[model samples]
Target: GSSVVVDTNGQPVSNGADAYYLVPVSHGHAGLALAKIGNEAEPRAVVLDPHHRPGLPVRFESPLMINIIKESYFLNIKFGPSSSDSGVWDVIQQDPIGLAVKVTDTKSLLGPFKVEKEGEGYKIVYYPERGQTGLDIGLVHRNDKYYLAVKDGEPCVFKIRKATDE
Candidate 1:
């Protein structure tokens, strides 16, 4: 669907795959997004044109469920945290942009990183040219969105879920 889950300010929660938010404005169909919380401090000037460009889409079949505070999110973890640190992640929303690429709250503050499924979790390639390191550190959900400092989740297993009020 065209409508994506967003914040109170009208920013799409996350497209999913790209980890980029659905912004209000747009040059192509996809609007620009804030890289990540507490990292960039400024949104990426570059707008990712996944349509015409058709950038490589990271596929994560049967991903896991997570929470940013109460908001449900998804994390496709592969090979467990011990095997690798990266994870293919997204939020629990109605059909996000794509497989949300998980990122370290601090390292990826400037932007989000895409990952691929490995064993039982996910993995990301290190872009030394861009100075992006491949760390196994994961992020935690907070009010509004995700933050780096908040560390709340199982080590490298279990699909997290909240209790339903029946």
Candidate 2:
């Protein structure tokens, strides 16, 4: 598919990986999308000509779903379908017209930083479903997208979801 799941504005992914809502827009003939809630999706700016892209049509093997939030100087994480296989997010998000900070940074009112680690990426996890936010300290990857924070899930507090949903 040519579309990705994005936050309400398609900005940087502040919350966790699964915190994405489908957007509705004319994707041309790129692919079909199931946008959640509303109508509006921004095209992937990286490749102006997506049809001929090398990796898109040739190397793509499985069903790929994405919610590309427009981010600058950032990394990314990709979730699959359910809680188990649908939670892993990647590190670092990149944009063509300079990088934009994750919406989380702006929401926290924490201006972007220049530090090597903390300044350039996500500072916390925001579960839109619960409308909650927490610092992303220790990351656990024994399974898939399951992570721990200082609140709801498991404060010390690692919430482990069995990898069966996918």
Candidate 3:
């Protein structure tokens, strides 16, 4: 099914904690990316819910249990300063800073992926970071939020809309 693309460059955003955040444990080594514009995608990373034991690491050797999608979103993480598009990823962390974003397979590799220009004085940001929880895979509950996620580690230009889509 195709998704309805809403040119949503404005929505509250959060940064995807470094994939290494899962290194100590195993909360699905993969990273995710979804459409903030619509509910047509799925979070592509591992979901961890250390509900009872919050601070502990994930059990890497265990099997995947819960997978209630529709609540998932684009898995975007900011490693350092520059967070560019890595195209495709198979995410496996062996270090802290210099983790790996392996491109296992390319879905939209067949892009006539066009480029749009930023409006006048359009401070299009890259590496947008958010501080809220629940954006992670396993975490349940979601806010119908989005952001101008052009890059990583940049200040987000959130687009808060009116209830009637004014």
Candidate 4:
């Protein structure tokens, strides 16, 4: 297995343990983080934002029964804080080319995602179905908002950081 995924503080990310923030690695999106857009329904769209609010904290649950989350393994990514009922991450089949990645409360809809090292950060990869080619999560600019959508080509790189109360 690859080395365990590390946080911004250079600590290992334990499975089903501490929460972390998915911080963008691009220069233009410096202070932006992945966060839920609204509180309307079960599957809420996530977007990159800096001022709309504090970013969402996410937890990883590995299927390998391993304590630490390692690279290239399928993982169940869950969002938090726990009080908010922020469920797991899923790729909704809303678009033809770019699938909208949203948070859903349905366990069956949860994604078995993988994290691959890309330069100094990591890029999220998802397999839409069994034996299908994996797609990278990219930022889809629509209506002046940047959304997390699965698409081909360049991947949206991010640095994982330990979530703080601030």
Candidate 5:
């Protein structure tokens, strides 16, 4: 068990924006920060196929469902597509303009979902907006994958290390 420390500038990065681009990672399992798809609105933690567009974030309501995370390299992340149910995510500025990433589960591919950095691991902060609480990202070992979690009190920095890498 660990403690989660809140940053002085913790605030929902997306806020009242049209939408947000949540990143994803697939060690052995898969999950992504998702929002109400279709004609509804609500932020949801969804675990579906990578090519599923993450259902991506899109909310016409308050407190959007988009989640923004950070890495040790100070680079922003987004789930990029490689193919249907197969792709890899890395540190790169692929967010174009201010529009939600548009890709579908059947139309096109999403990503393999990966997290990378120079060394060590990285940290994730779920900013709060619209009465939402900020979540500190922590990594834990489950089976054989790393999960970016925000449960058990406040969130903390994740000292990431792959079982095979190191």
Candidate 6:
């Protein structure tokens, strides 16, 4: 059975229509939000920071069931109008174990990800190849910035909220 995806306020997260912010659910980083960094002409990398107010609003790709998002169902994530150019979320090689998440106009390298319940928040998971095991999206800290990446061990958790809530 599938579970409904909920936002920070426990409201159902609508699919493909409304925009939402993926806020860090971890203690001490509650103020941090997922945002895009780098030049506009090039594909931008996603990062976590406190200063990106309202962060980057994003939407889930259209779901089969229509309005609601279901846990464990694959869906693409795209940056909303908050950004200068539209792009979908994707993973690129950063290290042997770490796959850095970025926004790009090209088809995603690793995506159609799913969400799973993680405490009070949700964790995103992706499959490297068809029918292969899934990996959780994690964070890698470098040069004072937190980059969303997939690695072994504990996954990062986030509570999504509607952009209008801010």
Report the number of the highest-TM-score candidate. 4
* Model with the higher TM-score, candidate 2 or 6: 6
Tell how far residue 42 is off in model 5, in angstroms: 23
- Give residue 39's lDDT in candidate 3 (0 to 100): 33
| Candidate 5 lDDT trough over 10 residues, lowest sum | 90-99
Of 4 and 6, which scores higher on TM-score?
A: 4
TM-score of each: 0.20, 0.19, 0.18, 0.80, 0.24, 0.80
Model 3 regions lying over 4 Å from their true place: 1-5, 9-86, 98-100, 106-166
Q: State the lDDT of candidate 6 residue by residue for 1-166, as single tens digits.
A: 1889988778888877788878777633433344444433543667766566557678876437678888856777888552323567777675522587877665443355788898778887876763457788887776577778885557888888887864
Candidate 6 residues lying further than 4 Å off, grouped into runs, are 27-43, 63-65, 82-85, 95-97, 107-111, 130-132
Please list the C-alpha lDDT of all candidates, in the order they appear.
0.26, 0.23, 0.23, 0.71, 0.28, 0.70
158 Cα displacement, candidate 6 (Å):
0.7
> In candidate 3, what are the lDDT values of residues 1-166, reduced to their tens digit?
0221112333322222111122112222222233222232544322223331221121101011322101122222222222233333333332221222223233222211111122221121111132232111112222432212222332212111112221
TM-score of 5: 0.24
lDDT of 6: 0.70
**In model 2, what lDDT does residue 48 have?**
13
- Could you tell me which residue pairs clash in candidate 5? 12-128, 81-110, 87-111, 87-112, 88-112, 136-155
59-143 per-residue lDDT for model 5 (tens digits): 1111224333222112222333222221211211122211122223232122222222312222344332312333444443332
| Model 1 agreement with the true structure over 69-130: per-residue lDDT tens digits | 11222223221232233432322211122122333222222222233233343223222223
Could you tell me the TM-score of candidate 4?
0.80
Candidate 6 clash pair list: none
Better of 1 and 3 by lDDT: 1
**Candidate 1 off by > 4 Å:** 1-117, 125-133, 147-166
- 1 or 6: which has the higher TM-score? 6
Error of 3 at 108 (Å): 13
lDDT of 3 at 166: 11
Descending-TM-score candidate ranking? 4, 6, 5, 1, 2, 3
Backbone clashes for every candidate come to 19, 22, 17, 0, 6, 0
